[PDB]
Write a protein that binds this ligand. Structure first.
Ligand SMILES: [Ca+2]
Ligand SMILES: [Ca+2]
Length: 177
């Protein structure tokens, strides 16, 4: 009498604190909630360090970690798919290094950098990306997206790099930034 949908998910980003002297590694997890035209539903549907919750309340970022201090996921974005508004069709997950050009930083310099998505109904890992190893030369990437498939939600890994940083990503998806 049990049937069948992803309903609550957590995206987790972690990395290790820089051991050499120099500016810290400040990685950032973001989310963009898109409409059926692939555009952010409003500028406040870009969830990041300066906007930690969606207006609808379905997507919340737990807070900005600017060094990597702490084990496991250093930043998390919690998504309650049940309460995502109907107008939202996809939620895309960028990962970036803050101020990477000025700091001359890339994922390959950072130790044990990973991003993952966990199905909270049972803590099963859905997908992981090894940023240190597989996005070595990158400073910003789209990890993946949750998307509607009929009445349910699925995840799709994307793994696409962007040379123009988090701002460039935000621009492509129609954020006024
Ligand atoms: Ca951060
Ligand atoms: Ca850490």
């Amino acid at each position: 009498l049990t049937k069948e949908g992803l309903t609550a998910v957590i995206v987790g980003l972690g990395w290790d604190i820089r051991t050499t002297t120099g500016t810290d590694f400040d990685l950032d997890a973001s989310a963009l909630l898109l409409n059926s035209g692939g555009k952010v539903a409003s500028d406040a549907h870009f969830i990041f360090f300066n906007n930690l919750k969606s207006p609808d309340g379905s997507v919340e970022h737990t807070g900005d970690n600017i060094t990597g201090e702490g084990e496991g996921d250093d930043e998390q974005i919690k998504i309650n798919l049940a309460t995502v508004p109907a107008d939202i069709e996809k939620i895309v997950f960028p990962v970036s290094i803050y101020d990477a050009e000025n700091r001359q930083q890339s994922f390959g310099q950072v130790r044990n950098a990973f991003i993952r998505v966990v199905n909270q109904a049972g803590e099963a890992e859905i997908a992981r990306y090894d940023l240190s190893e597989d996005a070595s030369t990158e400073t910003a990437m789209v990890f993946g997206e949750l998307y509607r498939h009929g009445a349910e939600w699925k995840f799709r890994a994307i793994g696409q790099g962007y040379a123009s940083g988090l701002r460039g990503i935000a621009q492509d998806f129609g954020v006024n930034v």
